[PDB]
Amino acid sequence: MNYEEVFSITITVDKPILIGQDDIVGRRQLIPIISGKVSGNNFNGKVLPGGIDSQIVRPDGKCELSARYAIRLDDGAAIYIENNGIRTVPDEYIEAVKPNAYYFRTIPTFETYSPKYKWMMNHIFVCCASRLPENVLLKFYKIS
């Protein structure tokens, strides 16, 4: 199995909007995306307004993540992204959750509006992520 690292995004997030928590569904929060820098070989630009990661930390500590946001490239192209994934920590970090620690991986789906980016809607992708301060680093890999 082969793959190609195609780009990265460093995203600056705002404080979580905590919606609610219990020990049946877990804890729901919305994470607003403030900004984001996109970079890669011929794939450079920024994250657009309107971005939100909708997250639930399940009672067992597993986080399920579903982000919806858009980017615009420096050539003028826009790409809409839905990024669906998981973040799990080992045992001594679980009550904290509810940095090297995490397993944090996602699958993005892309929607594009010009022939130059049609390939993004015709391959499978994996994203390897990390969180920091309040800014997640995302590496995107095209499955070859």
In this structure, what is the dihedral angle of CA atoms 86, 92, 93, 97, given to the nearest 10 degrees?
80
Closest CA to 105 of 69, 72, 131: 131
For residues 41 and 116, what is the distance between their CA atoms, to the nearest angstrom? 14
DSSP 119: G
> With binding defined as CB under 8 A, does residue 123 bind its own copies?
yes
Nearer to its own copies, 44 or 137 (CB): 137
Minimum distance of its own copies from residue 103's CB (angstroms): 7
> With binding defined as CB under 8 A, does residue 25 bind its own copies?
yes
* Residue from the set 44, 80, 94, 137 that interacts with its own copies by CB under 8 A: 80
The pair of three-digit structure tokens given for residue 25, joined into one six-digit string: 């569904």
Q: Could you tell me how many residues make up the chain?
A: 144
Nearer to its own copies, 101 or 143 (CB): 143
> With binding defined as CB under 8 A, does residue 42 bind its own copies?
no
- Beta carbons of 13 and 134 less than 8 angstroms apart: yes
Interacting residue ranges for its own copies, rule: CB under 8 A? 1, 3, 5, 17, 19-22, 24-25, 28, 30, 32, 48-52, 54, 56, 62, 68, 70, 77-80, 85-86, 88, 103, 105-107, 111-114, 122-124, 126, 128, 139, 141, 143
